Amino acid sequence: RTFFVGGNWKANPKTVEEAEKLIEMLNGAKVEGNVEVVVAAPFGFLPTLQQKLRKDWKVSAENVFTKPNGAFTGEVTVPMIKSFGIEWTILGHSERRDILKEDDEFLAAKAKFALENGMKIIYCCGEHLSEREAGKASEFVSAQIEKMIPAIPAGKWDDVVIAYEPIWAIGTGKVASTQDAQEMCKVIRDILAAKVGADIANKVRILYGGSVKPNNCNELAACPDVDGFLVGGASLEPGFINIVNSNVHS
Amino acid sequence: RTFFVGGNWKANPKTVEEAEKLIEMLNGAKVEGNVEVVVAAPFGFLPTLQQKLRKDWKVSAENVFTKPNGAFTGEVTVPMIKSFGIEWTILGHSERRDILKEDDEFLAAKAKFALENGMKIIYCCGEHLSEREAGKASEFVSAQIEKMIPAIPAGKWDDVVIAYEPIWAIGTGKVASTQDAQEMCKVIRDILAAKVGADIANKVRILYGGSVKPNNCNELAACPDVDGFLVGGASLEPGFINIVNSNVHS
Numbered sequence: 310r311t312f313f314v315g316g317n318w319k320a321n322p323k324t325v326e327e328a329e330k331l332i333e334m335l336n337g338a339k340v341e342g343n344v345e346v347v348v349a350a351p352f353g354f355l356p357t358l359q360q361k362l363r364k365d366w367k368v369s370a371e372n373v374f375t376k377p378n379g380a381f382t383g384e385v386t387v388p389m390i391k392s393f394g395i396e397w398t399i400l401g402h403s404e405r406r407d408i409l410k411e412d413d414e415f416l417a418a419k420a421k422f423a424l425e426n427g428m429k430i431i432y433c434c435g436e437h438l439s440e441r442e443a444g445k446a447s448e449f450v451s452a453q454i455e456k457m458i459p460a461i462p463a464g465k466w467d468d469v470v471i472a473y474e475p476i477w478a479i480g481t482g483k484v485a486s487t488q489d490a491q492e493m494c495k496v497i498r499d500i501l502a503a504k505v506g507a508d509i510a511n512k513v514r515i516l517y518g519g520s521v522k523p524n525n526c527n528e529l530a531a532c533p534d535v536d537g538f539l540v541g542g543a544s545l546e547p548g549f550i551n552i553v554n555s556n557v558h559s
Numbered sequence: 560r561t562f563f564v565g566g567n568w569k570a571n572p573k574t575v576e577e578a579e580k581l582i583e584m585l586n587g588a589k590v591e592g593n594v595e596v597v598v599a600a601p602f603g604f605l606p607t608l609q610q611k612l613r614k615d616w617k618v619s620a621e622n623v624f625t626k627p628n629g630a631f632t633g634e635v636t637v638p639m640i641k642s643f644g645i646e647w648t649i650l651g652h653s654e655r656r657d658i659l660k661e662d663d664e665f666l667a668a669k670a671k672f673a674l675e676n677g678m679k680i681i682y683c684c685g686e687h688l689s690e691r692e693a694g695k696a697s698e699f700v701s702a703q704i705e706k707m708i709p710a711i712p713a714g715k716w717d718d719v720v721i722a723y724e725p726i727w728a729i730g731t732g733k734v735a736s737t738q739d740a741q742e743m744c745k746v747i748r749d750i751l752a753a754k755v756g757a758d759i760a761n762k763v764r765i766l767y768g769g770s771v772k773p774n775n776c777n778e779l780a781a782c783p784d785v786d787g788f789l790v791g792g793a794s795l796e797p798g799f800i801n802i803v804n805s806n807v808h809s
């Protein structure tokens with residue numbers, strides 16, 4: 310399994326000028342080892358990103374809608390994205406699940422549609438504070454995964470990457486250990502093997518999507534079932550290359 | 560009050576190539592009379608629209624988020640929009656209120672933020688099938704407007720355009736008459752005059768956002784309180800210039 314680092318700029322930066330300055334930096338970074346690098350940026354900066362970003366890396370949407378086009382004011386669609394040559398989208402990020410209130414059914418249709426339409430997806434999952442405390446994280450994460458599975462057409466698992474987000478560790482006052490990340494990534498893999506088979510499970514990159522920084526990326530990379538990262542604030546910083554380069558420790 | 564025609568492409572077209580072909584057509588259209596023309600397009604096509612669209616017309620976002628930037632995966636913000644030179648956003652479109660479940664509080668903060676940050680807004684409102692049938696459209700629309708009013712900073716009403724959407728007439732089996740449009744636009748104006756004063760009310764463009772087509776734009780334009788249109792499917796068609804040019808009948 311090739312190590313996978315997604316950089317999720319989220320709703321950043323503020324200006325097209327900042328985004329270009331940031332691309333320029335990324336374009337000069339010396340990548341060490343073997344690693345699949347994907348960068349997700351807001352819709353408006355996607356064209357400038359697709360054109361200027363180093364061609365050995367890939368550009369991602371941070372979301373897409375369920376339909377190809379239509380009466381969906383404000384929504385961006387898979388065809389629009391692909392029309393720029395963009396091959397990736399993020400789906401199901403906690404912030405969308407919580408703030409924009411995206412439910413599993415919505416996200417299932419989004420995955421089905423994206424995959425049926427040639428996209429590769431970064432599908433996020435993760436449990437909240439209460440299930441963590443109840444010792445019911447495995448169950449909660451299985452339910453999310455069981456909802457995702459029927460969306461994946463045959464022959465498409467090669468185009469699926471799954472990201473675990475320790476949402477219980479985001480704005481709650483609690484922090485996740487390296488052991489936690491390994492453990493939940495193992496939970497997802499085991500869930501895959503049980504439900505869709507070992508060959509699939511052994512090839513699907515599962516990423517840790519908690520807090521990844523230069524000070525922790527190496528230990529995290531070393532975990533056997535962590536295949537890479539969905540990086541947050543460090544996407545916008547020079548330390549992003551440290552994180553990409555943590556692959557040598559996996 | 561200068562006649563105002565907004566073209567809302569919604570989630571269309573599918574490709575950047577189609578969007579450029581459509582801009583080219585728009586760029587050749589002979590505008591008659593006096594009219595303020597604004598074109599709203601999906602986030603990804605906004606750069607190509609800002610660069611190529613005739614400079615006597617203006618480009619619009621179809622939505623923006625409440626914050627300048629941050630942990631809001633998938634969201635586009637006012638600063639990103641303004642960084643391209645884009646001065647307009649649509650807010651509160653029925654499709655967002657319904658499909659993406661945007662409530663009034665959300666939309667109020669979105670208007671406050673946009674206006675405080677130099678944007679001009681097309682704020683949509685409109686009642687559903689049940690209030691229409693109950694004869695309670697005025698009340699329902701006032702509640703929406705009363706929620707919008709405190710968002711508008713002093714000196715900013717010059718940057719506000721309000722669009723009435725007969726949602727009761729969208730996918731319900733019912734059609735709106737020209738009289739209906741005039742009547743609801745008058746309701747909004749009267750609501751403005753009562754609450755924030757006659758001078759404001761007399762200057763705010765109020766638009767009809769129902770079904771506007773070449774076959775009805777002229778009669779609709781003639782209504783005294785209809786100041787223009789938020790155009791749907793006809794935005795994507797050559798008849799859009801007929802609609803822009805309906806201003807001569809107002």
Ligand code: NA
Nearest residue numbers: 464465467468
């Ligand atoms: Na395949």
Ligand code: NA
Nearest residue numbers: 530532535559
């Ligand atoms: Na590893």
Ligand code: NA
Nearest residue numbers: 714715717718
């Ligand atoms: Na002003």
Ligand code: NA
Nearest residue numbers: 780782785809
């Ligand atoms: Na008129």
